Amino acid sequence: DLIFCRKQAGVAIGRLCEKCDGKCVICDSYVRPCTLVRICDECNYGSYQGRCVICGGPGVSDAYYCKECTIQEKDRDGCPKIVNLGSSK
Amino acid sequence: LNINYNCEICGNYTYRGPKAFQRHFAEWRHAHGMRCLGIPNTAHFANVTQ
Amino acid sequence: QSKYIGTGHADTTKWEWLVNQHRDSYCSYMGHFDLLNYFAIAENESKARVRFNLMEKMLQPCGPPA
Amino acid sequence: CRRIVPGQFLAVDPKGRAVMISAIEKQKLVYILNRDAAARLTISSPLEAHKANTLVYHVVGVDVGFENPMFACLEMDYEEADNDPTGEAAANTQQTLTFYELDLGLNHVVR
Amino acid sequence: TVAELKQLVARPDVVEMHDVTAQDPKLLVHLKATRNSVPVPRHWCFKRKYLQ
Amino acid sequence: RLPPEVNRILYIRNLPYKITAEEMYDIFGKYGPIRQIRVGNTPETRGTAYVVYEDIFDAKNACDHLSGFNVCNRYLVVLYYNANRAFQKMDTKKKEEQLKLLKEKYGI
Amino acid sequence: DPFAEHRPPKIADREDEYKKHRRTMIISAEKAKAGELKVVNGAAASDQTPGATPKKLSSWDQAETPGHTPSLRWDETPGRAKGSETPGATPGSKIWDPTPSERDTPGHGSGWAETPRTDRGGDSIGETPTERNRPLSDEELDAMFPEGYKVLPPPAGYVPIRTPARKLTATPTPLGGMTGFHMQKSVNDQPSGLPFLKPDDIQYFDKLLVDVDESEEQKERKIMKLLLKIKNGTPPMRKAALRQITDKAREFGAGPLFNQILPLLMSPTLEDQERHLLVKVIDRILYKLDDLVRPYVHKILVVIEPLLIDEDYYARVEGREIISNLAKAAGLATMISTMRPDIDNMDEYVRNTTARAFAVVASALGIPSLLPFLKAVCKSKKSWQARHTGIKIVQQIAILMGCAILPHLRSLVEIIEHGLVDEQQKVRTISALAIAALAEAATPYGIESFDSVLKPLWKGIRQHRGKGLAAFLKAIGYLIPLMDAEYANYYTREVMLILIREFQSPDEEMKKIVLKVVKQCCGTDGVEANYIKTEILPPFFKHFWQHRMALDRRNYRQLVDTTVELANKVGAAEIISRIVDDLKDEAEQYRKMVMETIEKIMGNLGAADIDHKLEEQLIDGILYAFQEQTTEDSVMLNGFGTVVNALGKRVKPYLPQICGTVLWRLNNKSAKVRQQAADLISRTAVVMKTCQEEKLMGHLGVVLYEYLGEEYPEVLGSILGALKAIVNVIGMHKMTPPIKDLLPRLTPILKNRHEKVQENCIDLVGRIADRGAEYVSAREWMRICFELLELLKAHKKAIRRATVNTFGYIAKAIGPHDVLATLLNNLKVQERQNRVCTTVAIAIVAETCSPFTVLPALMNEYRVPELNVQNGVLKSLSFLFEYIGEMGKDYIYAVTPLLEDALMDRDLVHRQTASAVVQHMSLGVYGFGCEDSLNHLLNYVWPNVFETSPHVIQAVMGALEGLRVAIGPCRMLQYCLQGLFHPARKVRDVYWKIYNSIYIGSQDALIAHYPRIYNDDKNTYIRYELDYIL
RNA sequence: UUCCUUGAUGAUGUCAUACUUAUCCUGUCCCUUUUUUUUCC
Incomplete structure (x- = not known):
């Protein structure tokens, strides 16, 4: 019901809301932000301009990835823009 | 246990369990059949039947 | 996982697994400049004829399936 | 060095517009380029050529001055070659020349 | 024959009962022997689910 | 001036298993002409019955007064029957003949 | 009725007259041309069906490429029996002349239905030249x-x-007649029963009025009343029953189920919840059954599709979710062969919805799968109603698939053009409408794909009256952004006229449209400033800005937007100048509107443009509004804040009037409005500072300080907030309620239970115990500690969040041992308490002085026999290493034996959490050379591999992944060889899952580590290269 | 040469109790807006 879109990784900076704000996206964690989020404008467009990469609210900041997911190199897979397995709106 | 089985090298003997037959591999008589047969003992020949 | 090639599953045949690691051996050999040059030296050819040959042997290696 | 991840072969247009990049197998991506407001080089977002089980021997920029650009992926399929128990498809396959065609306006890339 | 499947292996002892159950003994043999690798652990076929 | 859900059918329950079509037809007979009736004769549906009239407003007057009405020592559950559901045991059809008929006599 | 009162605030109907047919729904190659004469002939025999024939021949244009799949798709549409017959005969005639150079039943029932409506309607047509009550x-x-x-x-x-x-x-x-009672050993208790049956529901669950066993199918139906335990009862019942049905999926099979749901998902009286749940059952079983559902598919949508048309959003998104899950779940040709006949169904409703269905199934199976079908439809020549639909379909495809429509854009359009010219109107209308939606997803691109569309459009624009007209605008407008401002230049210059003449209509569909247009037309770079200033504005502000508009929702927004963009061009003072005077117009929603508009504008453009006199009119305004607030709403408040922070030191003359009101309001007016003014301070802090109005800072500091005795939560919250932001401007040692006074004054509040308090408080306490922190004697702190500790009952995340971070700040102030000793107090006997956030304290603490201190305390505390606190300490290590990283290169040894113990069983949980420790350690150390031990641990890890217990497993996957990077593959792979081919299934399942995870990363490394493998007869598995020796 | 009590599983049961995910407990309303074309210097 809730899983990744994993469409291709564009240049568009990620956008996170109030709620999600601290979280390294995949490791769920606040620890050690280092590097930066990219998603496809397909995932990120329009009403999604500055939209949460989780909940559907306006982005007030920019998710940083952990270092943990870094050395395991996951940040480079398909764009982590979570789709509810209904549509994305 | 109590399941029909047979060892061929020993007197075409019958064994009622697989744990027991797996214990036959280390035994006096089984090694006597091997060594007196000219097939030397211990651990390479464990899986023998015929 | 599936659309990422080289994925296995428990039904994986001997043959397929080995052909995989062949191919990957190759894209390494095309990759690592030196390793390549090594081959070239040993069996005397061009760099090229090497890479070419390899890219022939890509689909084949081991020969036909079973 | 992967089997599937680009960077191996690299090609780019005369007019510099866009640049195509490719692994050996399965992936060919394309980054488009245009100089910024101040004519400093800004990079597009990527695209994808994906085609399954296809070997790319070699890729080369193409010439069309101010068109939708072209590229030459020298290819071969091995998929015939697997599902031939015999070893006939081992022979009697020919490597397939294909020109891919960027298309700006539509912004995808079509065989 | 789990018999004559046993004369092809340097350490044929590594063949075990469920082994010729193997889909690919002709291989599994040649692997499981391999230089430094580690045996698969023993707890399954013991149905007691690892600790008591 | 009516709720849409109610229909010419009523589900009717809290019946005895002796009970008579004579009683039934009479009692229900008040409000209007009976389209017809069914009685559950089966291991489960022994005890219940369906009732259907030539008009709804018939039935409306029914569920109105017969609400919780008594028979024997029992109180009858009196409900507007649902619909749709499991019927399609009977396939839609039987047009062709008939609609040719209206096609014919009246010519229309 | 009062029960009809408190029961109606349970649930509620929500629906129109229009949507209530729902009740009515009863359940379930020139010889390629003359060839088309052939195909038409034969199928026509096997009458008249059109878009079938077109889905057939619609495989032409890929020529040479059409295959078996023709038999698939067509196989469903016609009875798969005749299928083979035909498509076989075809493939023959095609290969040759290539050289020499129940469903059917269903539709029958439809043509029936309308033939009937013709008979009756005509009967009252000649009867008028002369329903549910229809006899039976x-x-x-x-x-x-x-x-x-x-x-x-x-x-x-x-x-x-x-x-x-x-x-x-x-x-x-x-x-x-009349009836007469008479004044004068009973039995028979009726069984009405098992959680509970509403009265109405008897009709469904009646068979639970019987009490028996020994009947077999009927035992499956009679066992499927597990539903009722879904529909009604207690939450836990719902849960457990729910799974019990899930695993009983395969077994009972769909047929019985849906037979027993769809009545309920049709229930005239259904709830909200009951609806939503019964959806849940339909999804969940639809994760399982696949091939199964086929005969049921239409027999599903009929319920579901109405979900698409719902006031509730979350409703919709569920609906879409399951219509995919079905459609993908079933087969494509299933979906199609199913869903034709609803296209021409008389009711516009069922069409409409039927589209949105096809939208979804298309998101599932991709456009190009489905195209030749559509493209067939829009060329259906029987009747338009279809085409009206098929086009609609194009649209809702547009909306859903959105930004991704891009590639087949050209094809889609190549459908839809043939509409615009049509004789029927709607078809024009809807058509164009689609073009719009397309472009709105095509942003910005594919311009010339739309290309051949225009030249009609522009012409069409001229000649029209009516809804269609403005529709064509809806398109063009969304085009213009896509053109070249030279070509776009011209064409723009034509439109802005008709736009002008059309402001004025009464139609609201209109005003929305023409509005959004102006956003785009004059929303352009290649349009000239003055020109807008003259022609448009004065109308614009005239007819639009009116009280009709803002009361409605959308129009409100769309408006704000538009006006904003006219600012982004013609400047600021222009707009704002004209709408200032309306802050003082009475009615709220209006004011609210002007207010937010301005807020944005001085958001984007900047204050700097604004003159003076106008400005007086601002602040006078923005108070006058702010002084009267129906509710407390973020709007006026933010709108203000931005106003000030934009004006900067232009603001300064105005304070006294502000802070004057700020106080006056602040008091009285009874408390509801208080929190507002409080916030108002919150946001304007910064402005009270840099300008250096300190008397103001005396005022605020102290007078806020008094309210902190206010008992209403919703004031005190905002109060503190103000305090916090007051602190962020004036430093500690200049604080006018000098901290010594304050910080204790806070301290007792922490009980406050209510939310907003706990938030702003712990926030505050945090800032101050971070920054100043010397001001307050230690003793006070340790009181703070022993008060914090139970803030960890917070239902909320954020509280605990900052809570922890504070716990650290003070832990710095004092020094560690105690504060963990104090944290160490949480125990295994309870659990919910010291669940983990406490552990997170142990962590952060353990950093903020050298952890190199703290361990021995911790480690030793794993001795304690109380189980759950044991595992607690394990996680402590977990977060601990996650937070330390490199430093682990030391204490690793300390833990390793402990990890050995915990990792060896007591219970799972030991192994789970501990293993996690292995993870974060294994990353952190990376490549400093401490592997050896980590190898050692790998052992005691390893056996854990096997289990079903989801947390244990995804834990372990965690472990071995990290361990890979630490140890390197080669070692790993040396645990994973033997596993691959092991005869059993169980093992192979896993060792494969591992070897994958090893495999994806570091695929490049491996090559070395595949061992030598002896080549067999047909093949060579020895890679000869590596042995070439110079 | 003439002799004791016992262990264990697996399957089916809506009993019982601990526990796991920085899960969850607040976000959230926005293109459902659908009709036989029909708004007059």
């Missing part, structure tokens, strides 16, 4: 009732009175 036949009656009922006769005298009933219903309606 016994053939029909048997079908409606389920199985298992006798019809009766009581008597032909009985049924004669019945026959007499009507005639004697009027007759004996007027006759004698």
Whole structure:
């Protein structure tokens, strides 16, 4: 019901809301932000301009990835823009 | 246990369990059949039947 | 996982697994400049004829399936 | 060095517009380029050529001055070659020349 | 024959009962022997689910 | 001036298993002409019955007064029957003949 | 009725008259041309169906490429029997002349239905030249009732009175009667039963009025009333019952199920919740059954599709979710062969929805799968109603698939053009409308794909009256952004006229449209400033800005937007100048509107443009509004804040009037409005500072300080907030309530239970115990500690969040041992308490002085026999290493033996959490050379591999992944060889899952580590290269 | 040469109790807006 879109990784900076704000996206964690989020404008467009990469609210900041997911190199897979397995709106 | 089985090298003997037959591999008589047969003992020949 | 090639599953045949690691051996050999040059030296050819040959042997290696 | 991840072969247009990049197998991506407001080089977002089980021997920029650009992926399929128990498809396959065609306006890339 | 499947292996002892159950003994043999690798652990076929 | 859900059918329950079509037809007979009736004769549906009239407003007057009405020592559950559901045991059809008929006599 | 009062605030209907047909729904190669004469002939035999024939021939244009799949898709559409016959015959004639150079039943039932409506409607057409009450036949009656009922006769005298009933219903309606009671060992308790049955529901669950066993199918139905435990009862019942049905999926099979749901998902009286849940069952079982659902698919959508048309958003998104899950779940050709006949169904509703269905199934199976079908539809020549639909379909595809439409854009359009010219209107209308939606997803691109569309459009624009007209605008407008401002230049210059003449219409569909247009037309770079200033504005502000508009929702927004963009161009003072005067217009929603508009504008453009006099009118305004607030709403508040922070030191003359109101309001007016003014301070802090109005800072500091005794939460919250932001401007040692006073004054508040308090408080306490932190003697702190500790009952995340971070700040102030000793107090006997956030304290603490201190305390504390606190300490290590990283290169040794113990069983949980420790350690250390030990641990890890317990497993996957990077593959792979081919399934399942995870990363490394493998007869598995020796 | 009590599983049961995910407990309303074309200097 809730899983990744994993469409291709564009240049568009990620956008996170109030709620999600601290979280390294995949490791769920606040620890050690280092590097930066990219998603496809397909995932990120329009009403999604500055939209949460989780909940559907306006982005007030920019998710940083952990270092943990870094050395395991996951940040480079398909764009982590979570789709509810209904549509994305 | 109590399941029909047979060892061929020993007197075409019958064994009622697989744990027991797996214990036959280390035994006096089984090694006597091997060594007196000219097939030397211990651990390479464990899986023998015929 | 599936659309990422080289994925296995428990039904994986001997043959397929080995052909995989062949191919990957190759894209390494095309990759690592030196390793390549090594081959070239040993069996005397061009760099090229090497890479070419390899890219022939890509689909084949081991020969036909079973 | 992967089997599937680009960077191996690299090609780019005369007019510099866009640049195509490719692994050996399965992936060919394309980054488009245009100089910024101040004519400093800004990079597009990527695209994808994906085609399954296809070997790319070699890729080369193409010439069309101010068109939708072209590229030459020298290819071969091995998929015939697997599902031939015999070893006939081992022979009697020919490597397939294909020109891919960027298309700006539509912004995808079509065989 | 789990018999004559046993004369092809340097350490044929590594063949075990469920082994010729193997889909690919002709291989599994040649692997499981391999230089430094580690045996698969023993707890399954013991149905007691690892600790008591 | 009516709720849409109610229909010419009523589900009717809290019946005895002796009970008579004579009683039934009479009692229900008040409000209007009976389209017809069914009685559950089966291991489960022994005890219940369906009732259907030539008009709804018939039935409306029914569920109105017969609400919780008594028979024997029992109180009858009196409900507007649902619909749709499991019927399609009977396939839609039987047009062709008939609609040719209206096609014919009246010519229309 | 009062029960009809408190029961109606349970649930509620929500629906229109229009949507209530729902109740009515009863359940479930020039010889390629002359060839088309052939195909048409043969199928026409096997009458008249159009878009079938077109889905057939629609495989032409890929020529040479059409295959077996033709038999698939067509196989469903016609009866798969005739299928082979035809498509076989075709493939023959095609290969050759290539050289020499129930469904059917269903539609039959439709053409039936409308033939009938023709008969009746005509009968009152000549009868007018001369419904549910329609009389019935016994053939029909048997079908409606389920199985298992006798019809009766009581008597032909009985049924004669019945026959007499009507005639004697009027007759004996007027006759004698009245009824007389008489004043004067019972039994028979009726069983009405098992959580509970509403009265109405008896009809469904009636068979739970019988009490028996020994009946077999009927035992499956009679066991499927597990539903009722879904529909009604307690939450836990719902849960457990729910799974019990999930695993019983395969077993009972769909047929019985949906037979037993769809009545309920059709229930005239259904709730919200009950609906939503019964959806949940439909999804969940639809994660399982795949091939199964086929005969049921239409028999599903009929319920679901109405979900698409719902006021509730979350409703919709569920709906879409399951219509995919079905459509993908079933087969494509299933979906199609299913869903034609709803296209021409008389009701526009069912079409409409039917589209949105096809939208979804298309998101599932991709456009190009489905195209030749559509493209067939829009060329259906039987009737338009289809085409109206098929086009709609294009649209809702547009909306859903959105930004991704891009590639087949050209094809889609190549459908839809042939509409615009049509004789029928709607088809024009809807068509164009689609083009719009397309472009709105095509942003910005594919311009020339739309290309051949225009030249009609522009012409069409001229000649129109009506809804269609403005529609064509809706398009063009969304085009213009896509053109070249030279070509776009021209064409723009034409439109802005018609736009002008059309501001004025009464139509609201209109005003939305023309509005959004202006956003785009004059929303352009290649349009000239003055020109807008003259022609447009004065109308614009005239007809639009009116009270009609803002009361409505959308128009409100769309408006704000538009006006904003006219600012982004013609400047600021222009707009704002004209709408200032309306802050003082009375009615709220209006004011709210002007207010937010301005807020944005001075958001984007900047204050710097604004003159002076106008400005007086601002602040006078923005107070006058702010002084009267129906609710407390973020709008006016933010809108203000931005106003000030934009004006900067232009603001300064105005304070006294502000802070004057700020206080005055602040008091009285009774408390509801208080929190507002409080916030107002919150946001304007910064402005009170840099300008250096300190008397102001005396005022605020102290007078806020008094309220902190206010008892209402919703004031005190905002109060503190103000305090916090007050602190962020004026430093500690200049604080006018100098901290010594303050910080304790806070301290007792922490009980406050209510939310907003706990938030702003712990926030505050945090800032201050971070920054100053010396001001307050230690003793006070340790009181703070022992008060914090139970803030960890917070339902909320954020509280605990900052809570922890504070716990750290003070832990710095004092020094560690105690504060963990104090944290160490949480125990295994309870659990919920010290669940983990406490552990997170142990972590952060353990950093903020050298952890190199703290361990021995911790480690030793794993001795304690109380189980759950044991595992607690394990996680402590977990977060601990996650937070330390490199430093682990030391204490690793310390833990390693402990990890050995915990990792060896007591219970799972030990192994789970501990293993996690292995993870974060294994990353952190990376490549400093401490592997050896980590190898050692790998052992005691390893056996854990096997289990079903989801947390244990995804834990372990965690472990071995990290361990890979630490140890390197080669070692790993040396645990994973033997596993691959192990005869059993169980092992192979896993060792494969591992070897994958090893495999994806570091695939490049491996090559070395595949061992030598002896080549067999047909093949060579030895890679000879590596042995070339110079 | 003439002799004791016992262990254990697996399957089916809506009993019982601990526990796991920085899960969850607040976000959230926005293109459902659908009709036989029909708004007059």
